[PDB]
Amino acid sequence: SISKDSRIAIIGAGPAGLAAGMYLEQAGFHDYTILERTDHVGGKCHSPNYHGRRYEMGAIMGVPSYDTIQEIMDRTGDKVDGPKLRREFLHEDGEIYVPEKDPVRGPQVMAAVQKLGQLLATKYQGYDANGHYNKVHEDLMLPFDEFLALNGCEAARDLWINPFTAFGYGHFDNVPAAYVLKYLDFVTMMSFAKGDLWTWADGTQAMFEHLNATLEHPAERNVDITRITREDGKVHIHTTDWDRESDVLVLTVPLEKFLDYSDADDDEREYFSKIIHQQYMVDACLVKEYPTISGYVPDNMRPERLGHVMVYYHRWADDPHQIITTYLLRNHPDYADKTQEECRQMVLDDMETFGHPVEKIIEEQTWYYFPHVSSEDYKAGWYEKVEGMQGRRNTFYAGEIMSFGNFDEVCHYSKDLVTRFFV
């Protein structure tokens, strides 16, 4: 429905933008340009060097059902070749426990998991589709805990919480089930629970760097876009060094932030203003009494413990002078959010409690993480509206807000965007 000769501007060279480029190009659209604000590609797949090995400041892992990322590796020749992930569980006092072996709670949890699985397989078919343009069951629009309570599956939250809340995506009291279950669908949940998890020796960034290089048009970097306007059936992009016209705009960058440098119409301003996000903070640490395994702290995943370390990543087992990254959240809709300063101190205090005291923090990043909307906004039909706007003034909406904030979901979405509107 769009001509192959169209000049397509793709904003952002993260996974979503690079995938958009890949799949446009493979569909015969050769006149695309990817515009990246920073000097690097990969976005939140960001794998810096330290003493000859790359550590992860952002994304780390995948599961075997990451089919779109497999397609990307097929193209780049990259392989899943990183160190194996292994985990223990700690209480907030640092004591090691084995929740799977609890003879009372364990069965309750796994019975709820069984029950939920069947609801997903029968009543809630369609729940796991990529994106939100196929309207999900109304129950899925409620916060996850409410969704679970409606079906008597509350205890299943013990299994779902670990790769969700600890992983920055927020808390089941408020995050709609729709996101939780598109990310952690039954198969994905099962893979995680099993530890069947992809990692990369060269970092998740590496395959995106390699993908960018395979493109007919590798991303243009250091592009400071000051204004985008969309008059006369055209797209006009003003940057600090040039201003140029395009036929189509594909956005893989934060849509609320897009309002600030664009001729955003009333609907764009109205809806994109409803976007909320997570403040997910990662500290790259050198530690004494080096851990022997990664640690998760369910106690610190409760909203009452906001800002505490929920998980830390043991990446390079053989070298106790390698980087251990820690993970915490600074926000929750029903709490005063936490400062960088007080959270950094909890990193220190928590790691000390866990028996792996921090000697040095070499890097720290609060990420713009998991853009989404509230249950109320989801229920009021946020996605019916925005997806209805796809193509308005030659503009297409993609990236994390349109799908889910993991790198397979956004790439899958970019791939399908080509199929939906372009081919």
Ligand X SMILES: Cc1cc2nc3c(=O)[nH]c(=O)nc-3n(C[C@H](O)[C@H](O)[C@H](O)COP(=O)(O)OP(=O)(O)OC[C@H]3O[C@@H](n4cnc5c(N)ncnc54)[C@H](O)[C@@H]3O)c2cc1C
Ligand Y SMILES: CCCCC/C=C\C=C\CCCCCCCCC(=O)O
Q: Which residues bind ligand Y (CB under 6 A)?
A: 60-63, 85-87, 163, 167-168, 188, 192, 195, 294, 311, 313, 327, 406
| Contacted entry of ligand Y, ligand X, none for residue 86, CB cut-off 5 to 8 Å set by kind | ligand Y
Residues 12 and 19: their CA atoms lie apart, in Å, by 11
From candidates 7, 37, 137, 236, binder to ligand X by CB under 6 A? 37
From candidates 10, 22, 24, 35, binder to ligand X by CB under 6 A? 35
Residues 99 and 41: their CA atoms lie apart, in Å, by 39
Per-residue binding string, ligand X, 332-371, x by CB under 6 A, is -----------------------------------x-x--
From candidates 15, 21, 143, 170, binder to ligand X by CB under 6 A? 15
Q: Is 225 in the site for ligand X (CB under 6 A)?
A: yes
Residue with token string 């005291």 = 357
| Contacted entry of ligand Y, ligand X, none for residue 58, CB cut-off 5 to 8 Å set by kind | ligand X
| Contacted entry of ligand Y, ligand X, none for residue 32, CB cut-off 5 to 8 Å set by kind | none
CB of 3 to ligand X, least distance (A): 25
Residues 420 and 302: their CA atoms lie apart, in Å, by 40
* Secondary structure (DSSP) of 190-225: HHHHHT--B--TT-HHHHHHHHHHHSSSPPB-S--E
CB of 120 to ligand X, least distance (A): 21
| Contacted entry of ligand Y, ligand X, none for residue 37, CB cut-off 5 to 8 Å set by kind | ligand X
| Contacted entry of ligand X, ligand Y, none for residue 311, CB cut-off 5 to 8 Å set by kind | ligand Y
| Contacted entry of ligand Y, ligand X, none for residue 144, CB cut-off 5 to 8 Å set by kind | none
From candidates 61, 153, 309, 343, binder to ligand X by CB under 6 A? 61
**Beta strand residue intervals within 310-385, DSSP E:** 311-314, 324-329, 358-372
User: Considering beta carbons, is residue 167 or 396 the nearer one to ligand Y?
Assistant: 167
Residues 201 and 95: their CA atoms lie apart, in Å, by 31
DSSP 306: T
| Contacted entry of ligand X, ligand Y, none for residue 203, CB cut-off 5 to 8 Å set by kind | none
Alpha carbon of 177 to those of 161, 333, 359: distances in Å? 12, 16, 39
CB of 256 to ligand Y, least distance (A): 22
* Secondary structure (DSSP) of 369-382: EEEE--HHHHHTTH
Bridge-based pairing of strands 235-239 and 225-229 is antiparallel
Pull the structure tokens for residue 14: 């993260």
* Interface size with ligand X, residues (CB under 6 A): 34
CB of 130 to ligand Y, least distance (A): 15
Phi first, then psi, for residue 104 (nearest 5°) are: -110, -60
User: Considering beta carbons, is residue 132 or 153 the nearer one to ligand X?
Assistant: 132
| Contacted entry of ligand Y, ligand X, none for residue 87, CB cut-off 5 to 8 Å set by kind | ligand Y
From candidates 21, 58, 170, 176, binder to ligand X by CB under 6 A? 58
Residues 163 and 152: their CA atoms lie apart, in Å, by 21
Q: Is 401 in the site for ligand X (CB under 6 A)?
A: no
Q: What's the per-residue H, E or C state across 19-36?
A: HHHHHHHHCCCCCEEEEC
Is 140 in contact with 178 (CB distance < 8 Å)? yes
Residues 278 and 170: their CA atoms lie apart, in Å, by 7
Site for ligand X in 262-321 (CB under 6 A): 280, 282
Q: Which residues are CB-neighbours of 269 under 8 A, at least 6 positions away?
A: 259
Q: Is 43 in the site for ligand X (CB under 6 A)?
A: yes
Q: Is 207 in the site for ligand X (CB under 6 A)?
A: no
Residue with token string 């659209």 = 29
CB of 317 to ligand Y, least distance (A): 12
Pull the structure tokens for residue 113: 């998991």
User: Considering beta carbons, is residue 225 or 287 the nearer one to ligand Y?
Assistant: 287
Residues 56 and 59: their CA atoms lie apart, in Å, by 6
CB of 106 to ligand X, least distance (A): 26
CB of 301 to ligand Y, least distance (A): 12
Strand partners, 396: 250
Contact residues: ligand X, CB under 6 A:
11-17, 35-38, 43-45, 58-62, 223, 225, 252-253, 280, 282, 367, 369, 399-400, 405-408, 410
